[PDB]
UniProtKB/TrEMBL annotation, chains A, B:
It comes from the Viruses. InterPro entries: Aspartic_peptidase_AS, Peptidase_A2_cat, Peptidase_aspartic_dom_sf, Retropepsin-like_cat_dom, Retropepsins. One of its GO terms (biological process) is proteolysis. Residues 20-89 form the Peptidase A2 domain. Pfam families: RVP. GO terms for molecular function: aspartic-type endopeptidase activity. The keyword rRNA processing does not apply. It comes from Human immunodeficiency virus type 1. It is a lipid-anchor. GO terms for cellular component: host multivesicular body; virion membrane. This is V-1 protease. The keyword Kinase does not apply. The gene is ORF. Keywords: Aspartyl protease, Host endosome, Hydrolase, Protease. It is found in: Host endosome, Host multivesicular body; Virion membrane.
Length: 99, 99
């Protein structure tokens, strides 16, 4: 699909048997979601940007479905104000910027 | 052009007759650049990010070239981690997300 940028590029994602709305963010290196539970082991990580840093839990090899496109990758979980889909997963769904 | 996301989508922009490196960021509503000087009066603006908020200076009708594409719009200046080209200008240069 082709998504314009007149409005925030929000899409529904399916992760851990849960449905959530997330922002397709080309400026984000990693995918970070609001507090939720995920399987497997995790590593603490600190991610920052505008406003400073937040502490998150890093889970690797996590399955996620974005706009029907399945992908696997690292998901950070923490106090983010919005669910973000970063480049680490945008690449897997073949997402590109065009102009 | 078509830009893949295996790496940060950093491009060259020109503003105030100077070249700067910036991030094409679909997750950003606005364009925010690191401290610099711009003409005219400015208005107050707060941008909410991953770690909280920051105060910035808002300048309107500013000429800016993005990857060779000329644009004229609102440019915010403040303590941002990197120069960010947000949706307000991505829409002006006809940029979209595709997959
Ligand atoms: C609302 O308009 C703007 C918001 C931002 C702040 N911002 C953010 O807070 N970040 C932080 C961030 C989040 C996730 C990541 O995986 C990530 O990895 C780099 C960074 N970004 C950025 O700041 C990009 C800059 C950057 C580059 C390298 C680095 O080491 C740290 C930061 C990405 C932006 O898209 C964006 C994502 C976002 C949106 C709403 C609420 C919270 C965050 C900004 C402008 C708006 O108009």
């Amino acid at each position: 699909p082709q998504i314009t940028l007149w409005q925030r590029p929000l899409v529904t994602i399916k992760i851990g048997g849960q449905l959530k709305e997330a922002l397709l963010d080309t400026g984000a290196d990693d995918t970070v979601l609001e507090e939720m539970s995920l399987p497997g082991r995790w590593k603490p990580k600190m991610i920052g940007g505008i406003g400073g840093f937040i502490k998150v839990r890093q889970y690797d090899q996590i399955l996620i479905e974005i706009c029907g496109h399945k992908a696997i990758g690292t998901v950070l979980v923490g106090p983010t104000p919005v669910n973000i889909i970063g480049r680490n997963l945008l690449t897997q769904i073949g997402c590109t910027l065009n102009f």
